[model samples]
Target: KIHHHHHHMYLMNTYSRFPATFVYGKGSWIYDEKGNAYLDFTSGIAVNVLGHSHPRLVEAIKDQAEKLIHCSNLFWNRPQMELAELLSKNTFGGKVFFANTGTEANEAAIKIARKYGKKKSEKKYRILSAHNSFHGRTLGSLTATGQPKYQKPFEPLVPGFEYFEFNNVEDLRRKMSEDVCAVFLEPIQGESGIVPATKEFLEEARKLCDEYDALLVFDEVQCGMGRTGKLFAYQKYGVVPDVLTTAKGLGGGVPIGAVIVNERANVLEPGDHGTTFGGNPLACRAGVTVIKELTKEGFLEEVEEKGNYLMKKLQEMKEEYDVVADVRGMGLMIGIQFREEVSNREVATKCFENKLLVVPAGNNTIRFLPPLTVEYGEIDLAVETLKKVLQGI
Candidate 1:
């Protein structure tokens, strides 16, 4: 028999974790080991769109588990078809490729973009991304990230990536050329404090891609899947990307990644790229349920309403407290930037102590990613707790 030594034994020290362990969760609330309920505004870093243990999602997982869980990609499953159909119909009309995570989705995007570039000419294969943009953690995705902090350690990354200043049309124009085959962006930068790109910036990007014969890739892994009021973040901007990557909230909770390639960027023929567990039944089933629930009448409008309501409340807090520096973001994906004197990590810790969950991001801000179904009272409670935390601090 194996004996337990340190509590962290056998586990990789990848994350700076919290001490409390959650047993289960209800709508917008998670229970600790002691059954102490905490209002969850983090939502597993924007993955739980429908919130924890949504009835439809749970039922989908259960029924799919009993029926078929791990059918290979060689076989076609109904859930995958339905999910692909829903995603294609909702957003830009395109085919879908399912992987296990956001990183994988971005990885898939990179390959297709590179392949499409190669189709033009061997020399036309460089990819351009914006500074402070985050794609994913894998080699290809991380190289596309453009954040030095994540890429510096792993030197000699995938070559041919050039990063220009985000939301600066001039910088994008200056950096774009025929040599560059793809331009990647996050419609709303998530890890860097939920900064949204200007409409002009995206419009310029779209124009530049057309002029230079490059594909525009939007990595909405964090902001897509109805996180913002729209079904996808790019829809709000109305400047669609030729290639799109989404995960996190796509499956509601289960692990699934999707790469939506428009006809222009659809360069991969069957044998070009593939995954073993990419289009499994279980995850696709959850995705199907999520799309059905999210697409309901008045559902996304409510999310937009709630977001406006919450942001208005936070803006009031910014006026009330000197510690609060700025309030920005769209829909439920909001960031509360603090003054230089105020510490984001400390404020997030204080919120945790008060039984409220908020996530600290790269910028001097904490993010609010409450479930779309979070009640008005719950939002009030979270805001009240945050106000009190600032007061206590």
Candidate 2:
């Protein structure tokens, strides 16, 4: 029904797309027009945790479609209610606000932080974000993102934001004050070469937020949803945030995001924020299925075992190849940083040619976000492909 040749003409020139067009996918593999299969390590930019076309997720969507899809927010939907209960009960015991993507969830979080800040004083509206952090593309979330390259083109961003060094407790302590409304950060810096927050740094952040009476917001959009072998990345560190935002793999591939608020920061009123497509029956049903699957007994433990195996293999690769400078990340969200002479784009292109899919990140890093359902054999194949590609390079 659609022509690939004319795809570029009608679509907005927003993304720098790849040459290949995938027609279908299942588990950790996708097929192109010629039915050539590629091992999917990107997981739709870390969204498809259960892999593509998961039977449980597919059935949930289809069953919900037959019943109802979009009932307005004015009326309660069973799926939305169930999903919210699951999320809230599993995570922090607080209320849940749904959105269509990670950006909107973060936008809602920003608004809540600001509104909570206003409760103290209008002057307490300044937000602090980590350097090299990626929040979202929306105006407020963009302003919150610390990456200058993404924010430079869109100048005149929203005000009341300051940047600080991540994993630097001293810098965070020096910057914290009563005027700060919130401290936004990613538990693991996914876009910036998979840098993780040191345990001491996160613990210190919790202390500082308490001392300053400011909200600590964790942007777990990419690292949450069992990607880190934990239900949430913060859980690994035993640190809790006043507010948390998550999406990407939350719905297993469907578009859904959530802003979870603790009682302290739950200051939003009736008309503060809203989204029409957010929390619809369709997305909520998908989210419920994803949550159920992710929380099954031994599911996270298996992910941890596989992730450790993958990380061990990557560390070996780093030792074997001089080009591999660093290998770091938690669970399935791994990143391989190359040396200055190596081009991440070139490596990624080579992988693509060899029927492998990987995504590039900042600081010359190639990210691996294989689905939780990915098997040990698939990981072996991926590493072998990378070895061949590296040998070629």
Candidate 3:
């Protein structure tokens, strides 16, 4: 047995955590020590798509654990092999490079793009990502990340990386050239206030990359895995990227990331990219069940339905409340941008006090990222909770 009270004694204080230390979760609800069920709109930063500890997900791990947990890259596990085929067949129609997290996947993608670009011309090594973009925290991926606050301390980033204003085709067009190797972006950006890219912007991006012979990479780590009504945000926006990276919700609740590539961008050789725990059976098995569950009949449809329901409510809230500056989102992934004066942190803390969990992004925004299986009643409660919290604050 473990004491929740003393758990933080020896832990690193990296995350500015909330007051409540959750014990367990089921569906959209997470319980505290006193068994107060809070509607977890954060959903573990949009990871628990199937809700918490889903029966199917649980069974997948149990069955996979009994036989073998892990094997080296030298050996082949059916789960990893089968998962590769499933992911490849479903998206991009290219090979899958497994990694342990979103950053690793993008790291692999950066390498692939570098090699692919080098094949064309040695001079073509520069990369461009959007401002306000969040592309994991490693050196390469951190270099790709456009937000300055996160990157200020970690100066002297990787070379050949540049940034363009997001959703601005003209800005991207101005920056793109034959010297550029890759253009990385998130179809539905998450960390910087959940901004969704316009189709015209992405289309122009694709055309520019094609014209310049540079690869297009989409960081779907936060928006993919059926969170945004479709199986992938690229499919939702009708824009297919050459290199697609996803991880947050790929394994439902497990840690797994994949760098999916198209035929043109599929230039990763055997020794180019590899990992020890990347393609493990346990995480891959979780991915299999998660994908299977997501693709089932009425599963994604229900997610779309629930998302629309919550969006509608939030839309009303935006109009009704003076604090709400804007509501921008697609499907379940939503960002509630408050006015300049309204403290989003205070608002989030108030919600926490009122038994609601929400994730705060940069630029005075709080995101609504409830599980796909969230109930309408829970939605109603959350809306009311926010209303009351706002009124109190």
Candidate 4:
């Protein structure tokens, strides 16, 4: 076996990880190595949609593991075929491409958009993304990301990518042209403080894309799969994009991502794109289970109810605390923006000490991405703990 001085020695210093090492989890709580229980409001950064160790997801994974873990993309797999069919039937009736994460999904969408555009005209290769948007960390997706801090470190990003103010119809209209290949956006900007796009803005996006012949792409990696009290966040707004990318909760803790493209944007041919371990039997089976569970009658309605309750509680906190400058989000995905004087890191540390887990986002905001399965009692406990921490601070 390979020897290492410490765990951190061999690992890449990519993340400033938290100190605690959780051993196991169930439902909305996770236990650390010391057996300390923490309420998991972060939900593994919004990936564990059904909560930890969900029975259906676990059983599906276990059964699939017993049968087959992975078979190359050269051969067709039942789970992959089923998942693709189910997603197509439920969504925009488009073809599906599988990948391992949201970044890959976005990457594929970008490539498909470019190919689709180039088929029309070589000049139509420009891409537009909203300012403050978070697509992913890959080179292609990274270039599409609008945050300068993340982009500055990696200079000379992919060319022809531009940024516009989110929800500003004038800017979107003025910036768009036949030269643009696609417009990438998140229905709700997750990392950038959970900012939701205005209804009119989304409508205008649809209209502008139609007028400019640019493909509209929505990155629902964080807001999709019942997180917004709907199967997909775009459904709530009654606006559909030519391309939709989703991951995170789609596999219910498994690693899987999908890019759904409408007929118009499905320009990829036999060898345009490929993946090795994307739609494996294990992950696809897990995704099928998660999709079925999330679409069950009353599941999304319950999520809506719980989200309303959580939002009401957070709004009350915003009213009581001067430090909480704003509260915004849709459904279970919420953000609490604090004044510049109040450090969100400090508040998050206090919450961690109190056995509550929350994640900090851009713009001095604390994000709450609790599982849809979280109970009202657990939410109340989280709120009380936060209240106590704020009062003490």
Per-residue lDDT tens digits for candidate 2, residues 1-393, read 465565668888788766887899999999998899999999999999999999999999999999999987888999999999999988988899999999999999999999988889989999999999999999999999998989999999999899999998899999998999999989999989899999999999999999999999999999999999998999998999999999999999999999999989888888888989999999999999999999999999999999999999999999999989999999999999999898999999999999999999998999999999999999999999999999988
Top candidate by TM-score: 2
What are the Cα lDDT values of the candidates? 0.92, 0.94, 0.91, 0.94
Q: Which segments of model 2 are wrong by more than 4 Å?
A: 1-3
**Per-residue lDDT of candidate 4, residues 1-393 (tens digit):** 232334667788888766787789999999987698999999999999999999988999899999999998999999999999989988889999999999999999999999999999999999999999999999899998899999998888999999999999999999999999999999999999899999999999999999999999999999999999999999999999999999999999999999999999989998889999999999999999999999899999999999999999999999999989999999999999999998999999999999999999988999999999999999999999999999988
Residue 150, model 2: lDDT of 91
Model 1 ranges with Cα > 4 A deviation: 1-6
The candidate 4 region of ten consecutive residues with least summed lDDT is: 1-10
Model 4 alpha-carbon miss at residue 358, Å:
0.5
How would you encode candidate 3's per-residue C-alpha lDDT over 1-393 as one tens digit per residue? 355467777888778888886889998989987788988999899999889999999999999999889997888999999999989887868988889999999999899989998998998889999998999899999999998888889998898898999999899999989999999999988999999999999999999998999999999999999988889988987888899999989998999999988889989778877999998999999999999888898988888898889989999999999999999898889999889998989999999988899999988999999988888999899989999998877
Which is the winner by TM-score between candidate 2 and candidate 3?
2
Model 2 / residue 89 / CA error / Å: 1.3
Q: TM-score for every candidate vs. truth? A: 0.98, 0.99, 0.97, 0.98
TM-score of 4: 0.98
